[PDB]
Design an enzyme around this catalytic site. Structure first.
Site, PDB file in Angstrom:
ATOM      1  N   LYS A  13       0.820  -1.232   0.000  1.00  0.00           N
ATOM      2  CA  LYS A  13       0.000   0.000   0.000  1.00  0.00           C
ATOM      3  C   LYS A  13       0.838   1.258   0.000  1.00  0.00           C
ATOM      4  CE  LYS A  13      -2.299  -0.820   4.120  1.00  0.00           C
ATOM      5  NZ  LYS A  13      -2.096  -2.275   4.079  1.00  0.00           N
ATOM      6  N   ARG A  88      -8.629   1.120  10.501  1.00  0.00           N
ATOM      7  CA  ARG A  88      -8.101  -0.180  10.854  1.00  0.00           C
ATOM      8  C   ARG A  88      -9.042  -0.987  11.720  1.00  0.00           C
ATOM      9  NH1 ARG A  88      -2.634   0.246   9.256  1.00  0.00           N
ATOM     10  NH2 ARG A  88      -2.424  -1.797   8.246  1.00  0.00           N
ATOM     11  N   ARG A 167       0.517  -9.235  14.842  1.00  0.00           N
ATOM     12  CA  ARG A 167      -0.165  -8.293  13.980  1.00  0.00           C
ATOM     13  C   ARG A 167      -1.131  -9.047  13.096  1.00  0.00           C
ATOM     14  NH1 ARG A 167       2.299  -3.974  10.598  1.00  0.00           N
ATOM     15  NH2 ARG A 167       4.623  -4.447  10.641  1.00  0.00           N
TER      16      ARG A 167
HETATM   17  N1  LIG Z   1       5.017  -5.998  -5.682  1.00  0.00           N
HETATM   18  C1  LIG Z   1       6.012  -6.022  -4.802  1.00  0.00           C
HETATM   19  N2  LIG Z   1       6.945  -6.982  -4.905  1.00  0.00           N
HETATM   20  C2  LIG Z   1       7.845  -7.059  -3.923  1.00  0.00           C
HETATM   21  N3  LIG Z   1       8.038  -6.314  -2.811  1.00  0.00           N
HETATM   22  C3  LIG Z   1       7.086  -5.329  -2.687  1.00  0.00           C
HETATM   23  C4  LIG Z   1       6.089  -5.106  -3.707  1.00  0.00           C
HETATM   24  N4  LIG Z   1       5.359  -3.974  -3.325  1.00  0.00           N
HETATM   25  C5  LIG Z   1       5.810  -3.613  -2.152  1.00  0.00           C
HETATM   26  N5  LIG Z   1       6.846  -4.398  -1.668  1.00  0.00           N
HETATM   27  C6  LIG Z   1       7.532  -4.272  -0.351  1.00  0.00           C
HETATM   28  O1  LIG Z   1       7.308  -5.162   0.727  1.00  0.00           O
HETATM   29  C7  LIG Z   1       7.441  -4.440   1.960  1.00  0.00           C
HETATM   30  C8  LIG Z   1       6.096  -3.955   2.511  1.00  0.00           C
HETATM   31  O2  LIG Z   1       5.410  -3.040   1.658  1.00  0.00           O
HETATM   32  P1  LIG Z   1       4.541  -1.810   2.237  1.00  0.00           P
HETATM   33  O3  LIG Z   1       4.573  -0.746   1.178  1.00  0.00           O
HETATM   34  O4  LIG Z   1       5.130  -1.489   3.548  1.00  0.00           O
HETATM   35  O5  LIG Z   1       3.108  -2.455   2.348  1.00  0.00           O
HETATM   36  P2  LIG Z   1       1.893  -1.861   3.205  1.00  0.00           P
HETATM   37  O6  LIG Z   1       0.795  -2.576   2.508  1.00  0.00           O
HETATM   38  O7  LIG Z   1       1.859  -0.394   3.085  1.00  0.00           O
HETATM   39  O8  LIG Z   1       2.169  -2.399   4.674  1.00  0.00           O
HETATM   40  P3  LIG Z   1       1.139  -2.415   5.888  1.00  0.00           P
HETATM   41  O9  LIG Z   1       0.067  -1.417   5.829  1.00  0.00           O
HETATM   42  O10 LIG Z   1       0.566  -3.766   5.978  1.00  0.00           O
HETATM   43  O11 LIG Z   1       2.086  -2.377   7.185  1.00  0.00           O
HETATM   44  P4  LIG Z   1       2.647  -1.109   8.036  1.00  0.00           P
HETATM   45  O12 LIG Z   1       3.531  -1.832   9.028  1.00  0.00           O
HETATM   46  O13 LIG Z   1       3.275  -0.054   7.186  1.00  0.00           O
HETATM   47  O14 LIG Z   1       1.432  -0.576   8.958  1.00  0.00           O
HETATM   48  P5  LIG Z   1       1.289   0.820   9.689  1.00  0.00           P
HETATM   49  O15 LIG Z   1       2.577   1.467   9.940  1.00  0.00           O
HETATM   50  O16 LIG Z   1       0.224   1.654   9.065  1.00  0.00           O
HETATM   51  O17 LIG Z   1       0.804   0.462  11.166  1.00  0.00           O
HETATM   52  C9  LIG Z   1       1.829   0.018  12.025  1.00  0.00           C
HETATM   53  C10 LIG Z   1       1.504   0.076  13.515  1.00  0.00           C
HETATM   54  O18 LIG Z   1       1.009   1.372  13.891  1.00  0.00           O
HETATM   55  C11 LIG Z   1      -0.331   1.116  14.171  1.00  0.00           C
HETATM   56  N6  LIG Z   1      -1.348   1.873  13.508  1.00  0.00           N
HETATM   57  C12 LIG Z   1      -1.299   2.405  12.247  1.00  0.00           C
HETATM   58  N7  LIG Z   1      -2.465   2.815  11.838  1.00  0.00           N
HETATM   59  C13 LIG Z   1      -3.332   2.553  12.867  1.00  0.00           C
HETATM   60  C14 LIG Z   1      -4.668   2.764  13.005  1.00  0.00           C
HETATM   61  N8  LIG Z   1      -5.345   3.349  12.045  1.00  0.00           N
HETATM   62  N9  LIG Z   1      -5.214   2.430  14.148  1.00  0.00           N
HETATM   63  C15 LIG Z   1      -4.436   2.046  15.147  1.00  0.00           C
HETATM   64  N10 LIG Z   1      -3.142   1.774  15.178  1.00  0.00           N
HETATM   65  C16 LIG Z   1      -2.618   2.045  13.972  1.00  0.00           C
HETATM   66  C17 LIG Z   1      -0.565  -0.266  14.798  1.00  0.00           C
HETATM   67  O19 LIG Z   1      -0.182  -0.286  16.169  1.00  0.00           O
HETATM   68  C18 LIG Z   1       0.444  -0.982  13.880  1.00  0.00           C
HETATM   69  O20 LIG Z   1       1.072  -2.143  14.462  1.00  0.00           O
HETATM   70  C19 LIG Z   1       8.447  -3.379   1.623  1.00  0.00           C
HETATM   71  O21 LIG Z   1       9.682  -4.047   1.592  1.00  0.00           O
HETATM   72  C20 LIG Z   1       8.063  -2.958   0.203  1.00  0.00           C
HETATM   73  O22 LIG Z   1       9.144  -2.326  -0.552  1.00  0.00           O
END
Ligand SMILES: Nc1ncnc2c1ncn2[C@@H]1O[C@H](COP(=O)(O)OP(=O)(O)OP(=O)(O)OP(=O)(O)OP(=O)(O)OC[C@H]2O[C@@H](n3cnc4c(N)ncnc43)[C@H](O)[C@@H]2O)[C@@H](O)[C@H]1O
Length: 214
Positions: A13, A88, A167
């Site tokens: 994302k 979320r 998670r």
């Molecule tokens: N096609 C492809 N092929 C290969 N590799 C690829 C690819 N495309 C991408 N990749 C890669 O693979 C990896 C991941 O891609 P990435 O781009 O990081 O994927 P993403 O989908 O954005 O990741 P997430 O949303 O699942 O995780 P996050 O940990 O960023 O969550 P957040 O910080 O919001 O939340 C984190 C923490 O903060 C919290 N938090 C955040 N938002 C909330 C909320 N709204 N409510 C409460 N707590 C919250 C929670 O406590 C949580 O634990 C990277 O290496 C990237 O380069």
């Protein structure tokens, strides 16, 4: 324009939030990046959030809706924004609905469950900028170094494998119901819903998204 990026963990994302941000010119609103930023500045929210974050637990609804209302409210979210990581939980989604914020597109990035722990654990971050790399799948041009500032990349403590597993449970319970949520709404006439294959080339998915937005 307003867009929600929904998706499984690690599906890619945030790596796309950038592209949509330039191309369609709108603020990227990453609750992840903002809680992480509050943390590295010792702001009050940064004292609450870090232990939760670290633990894989989701931060509190009451708190994150508060963060995000303050931000949409700023003059740059004036012509739209893209939420990356808000909502979320159905709680966050109903609060946005109750507030009268209807969004144009909801995009779902899917990845098969086998990929999720690999996606997260090889993910390196250029901490100040929030620039996200994957050691194997999207690497920096110079290992360890970030492509723009030359500064070393790091690894998050919540990107540590047993936290990734905590998670995934919280996700399944908390956040998985929002696909159903936003699909009923797209059915009601309220938004547009599309699903994108989070396993393709960063390249291809980028294209898949232009072909959806414009
Ligand atoms: N096609 C492809 N092929 C290969 N590799 C690829 C690819 N495309 C991408 N990749 C890669 O693979 C990896 C991941 O891609 P990435 O781009 O990081 O994927 P993403 O989908 O954005 O990741 P997430 O949303 O699942 O995780 P996050 O940990 O960023 O969550 P957040 O910080 O919001 O939340 C984190 C923490 O903060 C919290 N938090 C955040 N938002 C909330 C909320 N709204 N409510 C409460 N707590 C919250 C929670 O406590 C949580 O634990 C990277 O290496 C990237 O380069």
């Amino acid at each position: 324009m307003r867009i929600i990026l929904l998706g499984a963990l690690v599906a890619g994302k945030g790596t796309q939030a950038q592209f949509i941000m330039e191309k369609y010119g709108i603020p990227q609103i990453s609750t992840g990046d903002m809680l992480r930023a509050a943390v590295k500045s010792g702001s009050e929210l940064g004292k609450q959030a870090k232990d939760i974050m670290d633990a894989g637990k989701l931060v509190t609804d009451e708190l994150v809706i508060a963060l995000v209302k303050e931000r949409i409210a700023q003059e740059d979210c004036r012509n739209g924004f893209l939420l990356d990581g808000f909502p979320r939980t159905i709680p966050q989604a109903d609060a946005m609905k109750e507030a009268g914020i209807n969004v144009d597109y909801v995009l779902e990035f899917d990845v098969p469950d086998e990929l999720i722990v690999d996606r997260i654990v090889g993910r390196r971050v250029h901490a100040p900028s929030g620039r996200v790399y994957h050691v194997k799948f999207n690497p920096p041009k110079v290992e360890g170094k970030d492509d723009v500032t030359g500064e070393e990349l790091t690894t998050r403590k919540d990107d540590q494998e047993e936290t990734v597993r905590k998670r995934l449970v919280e996700y399944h319970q908390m956040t998985a119901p929002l696909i159903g949520y936003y699909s009923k709404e797209a059915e009601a006439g309220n938004t547009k819903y599309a699903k994108v294959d989070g396993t393709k080339p960063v390249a291809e998915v980028r294209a898949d998204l232009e072909k959806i937005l414009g």
